Amino acid sequence: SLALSLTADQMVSALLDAEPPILYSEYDPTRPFSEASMMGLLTNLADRELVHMINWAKRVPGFVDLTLHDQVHLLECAWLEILMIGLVWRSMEHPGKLLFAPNLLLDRNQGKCVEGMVEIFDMLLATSSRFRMMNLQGEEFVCLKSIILLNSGVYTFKDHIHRVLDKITDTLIHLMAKAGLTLQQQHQRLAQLLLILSHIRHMSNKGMEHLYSMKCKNVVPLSDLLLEMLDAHR
């Protein structure tokens, strides 16, 4: 591969350059929001984000070396996690708020318009507040997201994937060493970051059941791409 031959500085630059753009939601319908209105904007946004995520995944070192089938499986398992950690990261300097889009900032109170959505909001806001108190850096964020991509589906199949995961681990430690953190502070923060991934997994599964519930109700029509990504978790 070419991923293993990368220095951690080159690994960071590769992931940092691979970053998907921040997309805007539809400027209509504009607030206030209802259930059909809000989910309509979110579905449209998430669907367009998926296209950029798939291109972003190809830019992730080591992801190319995998078979097409394995690439499909990994994205199918982790697509909502990746969207969520992206959402949480964007909403870091917006406490109490979730930045789905630069023109779509949502409150907790707005999450109540959809049955069972406000509980997911709180978990997302808590993750954002957690990232904020840790002062999560962008270089650390792009590492975490690629980890989620490669890890979340590696046990539902692979020595190559673990070798890349180790490389990203080596990269995370490098970044912390630059910040002047002691050896003890390096392992500790590494643990703290990776433990959050456990909560992100939890949010995704909670969100997956939510979307499946919306699908059944037939009200707000999911895109054919989203339906395929959703059906993969059944």
Binding site: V51, I54, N55, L68, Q71, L75, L225, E228, M229
Partner: peptide, 9 residues
């Protein structure tokens, strides 16, 4: 599936 087509392009 659509996911394959987007992964090949």
């Amino acid at each position: 599936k659509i996911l394959h087509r987007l992964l090949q392009d």
